[model samples]
Target: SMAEAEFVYKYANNLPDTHPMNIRAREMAAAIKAETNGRVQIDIFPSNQLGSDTDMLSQIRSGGVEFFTLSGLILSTLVPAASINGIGFAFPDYDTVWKAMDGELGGYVRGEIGKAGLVVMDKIWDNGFRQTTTSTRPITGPDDFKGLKIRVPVSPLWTSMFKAFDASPASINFSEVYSALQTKVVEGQENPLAIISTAKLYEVQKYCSLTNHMWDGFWFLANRRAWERLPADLRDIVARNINAAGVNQRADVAKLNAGLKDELATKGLTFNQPTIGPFRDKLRAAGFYAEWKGKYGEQAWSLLEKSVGKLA
Candidate 1:
């Protein structure tokens, strides 16, 4: 049934053609085809066409799929420590995230991903930095989050982060969120600036909080057994393309997240910078940061410390 060797790239988000991820996915597909000179092909399935993150991940494990563009929240479900790189404005800025992931710590995490059952032949992809866009009132602090219903990807840490604020965090698929918002099923949801722009959330949600609460990134993974079956040359080609895609995705995120506030407001969205200091303190006091200390080891903590400055 394998007519031609094609890499099916699965994504869970519902992004329009103008979205950075959509553009970058096309770029990756083209680049891979070009690099392989017709030997390899890539096709992207966006908008959760296949299924949920859990479903796609399962499909990949069974060799029913080739690759997936999975968010860190999805990864955290399986490997809790993987979310450390993206937690609470954790990497300072985009460059820090790029440096750490492309540098030592990223490679360490990539190896762990392979150990966990997928072939992480490349580094992480930066789609965009996350922010909150809500129809609810301006969120200026933890108190601002009280009683708001926030849509979240299914991750324990993410749910915990909102739970700390005494807010109702609901897990919903990316595709249904816009409708959910329109129907008043959820007060609002958090996503990257690009998502707010492309998904047209600014039209529905009045406020866009530069929460930067999380550093959202993607995992480009290959099915474990399927990856091993590739010839050495083919594997090398895929490896090279994955790395190239990472570079492209990172640059795209940087350009989009920058000046995103004004860009969003022009479309009728307001920006809010909450004094998240108290919220961070509360999370620390609740042992949110230390919960991973023993499980992920002190070195992991140290690496993150170097990245986020001595976790509380």
Candidate 2:
């Protein structure tokens, strides 16, 4: 398949030139075509043309798709380690997250991704940190979350966080979020600025909290069968190019995050930064993190605690 679509493509993958993921994907594609002398074409399906992140990954595994990109959240179901990056502020800032994913932790995560019946070509694409948005009121403090209807990915950790804030967490699929918001099925949801803009959540949301509660990133996964079919030379090329792409993508994410608030504000969204103490304490009080600690094992917990500057 080609690396990009030309079939009168209806979707314009919205990403800034500096976005690391886009940079990485485009550069790697160029590298691939150059290395292959245009013999092996790569058609990229960006902007979730293939489907939602998880949907595309599912297609890859079932042989309906060639490759897919996904955030670390999906990996939670397969490898518990995938959830480690987003666990209650494990990353102080974007740079630390990038460092970990590019260093030893990155290798470990990729190895775990392999166990999911896909070949992970890139350790991760820096998608930016996640922030919460609300429609009922400004999330200025943990108490602002009281009795709010918040939509969250189906994660126990998220539910616990909501409970700590006295908010009711509603589990909803990504694809259905817009409708749910429009219908008042949920009051709010959280995501990186790029996604919130892409999905146009700003239009429906009144307040955005820069909680930076979670770190977000994507993966380059190919079906195991599809990967195995590639010649050694091609495999090497794919691996190298994918890594290059990830670097570019992450860089873009970091740059975009810097200007994201202003960008959203221009579109009529307000931003707020709330203290983390109330929510953090709730997590401990609810035994939320404790429930996950033993399940994820001592090492993961220790790494997380160290990263967040907490004592376990």
Candidate 3:
């Protein structure tokens, strides 16, 4: 039973091991092992155990890591079209998100990713609608963002959106977000509540505004060589398990976020609910939507609008 398998691969992600992403991944790995009868094995390295997003991105390409999951915003560094999924205020709710990502828009994003040499899975795991967390004050509306120094993942879309609000955006990897905040390298950061709680970001940040500005998801990626190395039957089992786990993790995050606000409030973090209209208007006034519409081009922008309705 302990005999060596035909294939062993490592799957790495930036989320902590306790995260729902990892919990589902662990289950998927076990299912895959069982389905493959020990002929295939996957080892999960959570909390960037392998490296930061960029580092792990490179590792997957070099075959040092066989699988990885990354936010479309960060993944856009190599696949620009992938960032279309992260347009601020584009997704008003989870329904829009699922319809868009599970439909044509996701096909375009995944196609570009596949063309870039990674095997893209059929299902995208939820990172959920993001909220704003700050050390300075609660963000109530557009004006609160003025001159705020905020940490954003190294994505042009993220940096651009905050800049439109007149805030200073610092490009920091997720692994360093807490330290950057703890040391005051940035005054605030944004992420879904699932992240805020699991990463214990509430420890350093005091206020959370339910901005729900942008919804994000992780594309479960596998190196093409490693993917093709598996026999056809085994690949089917692996892909099926991965996608199944993705769907399960999506629900886990949705339910987790619904309850985290009350849970985090007991931890001393003040909460606010800000109207997104003013924020969207601020972006419109700043030509933020128009600018990105041009950059993302007609095709990607059109596909995006097809699901989220027109922007700019």
For lDDT, the strongest prediction is: 3
TM-scores of the candidates in the order shown: 0.90, 0.85, 0.97
| Candidate 2 segments exceeding 4 Å error | 1-24, 154-160, 306-312
Error of 3 at 212 (Å): 1.3
Give the alpha carbon lDDT tens digit for every residue of 54-132 in model 2: 5655577786766666656665666667766767756676656656676666677777778766777756766778888
Summarize candidate 1's per-residue lDDT along 1-312 as a digit string, tens digits: 555655443334345667767777777778777877667777777767767666776777777677777775677666666666656656666667767777777777787786778887557877666788788688787777888899988777688778776789998877778888887799989888877877788777888877778787887778777677666787788778777767876777777778677888889888878776776776677676777566578988788777655233
Ordered list by lDDT, greatest first: 3, 1, 2
Instruction: Give candidate 3 misplaced runs (Cα > 4 Å).
Output: 310-312
TM-score of candidate 1 to 2 decimals = 0.90
Q: In model 2, state the lDDT of residue 1.
A: 62
Candidate 1 vs candidate 2: the lDDT winner is: 1
Cα miss at 49, model 2 (Å)? 2.5
Q: Better model by lDDT, 2 or 3?
A: 3
* Candidate 1: worst-modelled 10 consecutive residues by lDDT: 5-14
Q: Write the per-residue lDDT of candidate 3 for residues 183-271, one digit (tens) a residue.
A: 89999999999999999999999999998888899999999999998899999999999999999999999999888999999996999
